[PDB]
């Protein structure tokens, strides 16, 4: 059966950025509920089970452009211990109610750390290889919760 609104879709994928394979795995998602980046959902629409294809998804329809306002300059004191506050290191800040907010360290100077709260793939065009493994109808509880049970990565 074909990918479409309110179907639970299982895909296998490889994700490459500028010729480097960054990710590879399998996931299930509820289609048409903003659970998957829009360019990839658009590429999958109407595809039959068993189809496999390659797709280029520009940043605009993936994780979006890099937002300059997501780059902040914070005190080194906010970082614990003396941890590894170096470029590329990932940390989590928490807001007033405890929500974890991931960041990547960009630079360190004096008592100041430049950090980036943008998604690591913001501003990147993404090259996928995708195989449609399974398509089924969603259960009532899946459409109520808005997500597949279970959702996300098999592997």
């Amino acid at each position: 059966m074909k990918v479409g609104q309110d179907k639970v879709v299982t895909i296998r994928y490889t994700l490459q950025v500028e010729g480097e394979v960054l990710d590879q795995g399998e996931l299930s998602y509820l289609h048409g509920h903003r659970n998957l980046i829009p360019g990839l959902e658009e590429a999958l629409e109407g595809r039959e089970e068993g189809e496999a294809f390659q797709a280029h998804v520009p940043a605009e329809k993936a994780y979006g452009p890099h937002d300059p306002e997501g780059v902040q300059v914070v005190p080194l004191s906010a970082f614990p211990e003396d941890a590894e506050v170096v470029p590329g290191a990932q940390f989590y800040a928490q807001d007033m109610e405890g929500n974890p907010m991931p960041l990547t360290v960009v630079a360190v100077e004096g008592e100041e750390v430049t950090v980036d709260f943008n998604h690591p793939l913001a501003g990147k065009d993404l090259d996928f290889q995708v195989e449609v493994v399974k398509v089924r109808e969603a259960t009532p509880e899946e459409l109520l919760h808005g997500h597949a049970h279970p959702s996300g990565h098999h592997h």
Binding site: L15, D23, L27, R34, Y92, M101, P102, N118, H119
Partner: peptide
């Protein structure tokens, strides 16, 4: 978007 699959940073 940052939470969307297949590559979820979080937020």
């Amino acid at each position: 978007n940052a939470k969307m699959l297949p590559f979820a940073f979080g937020a």
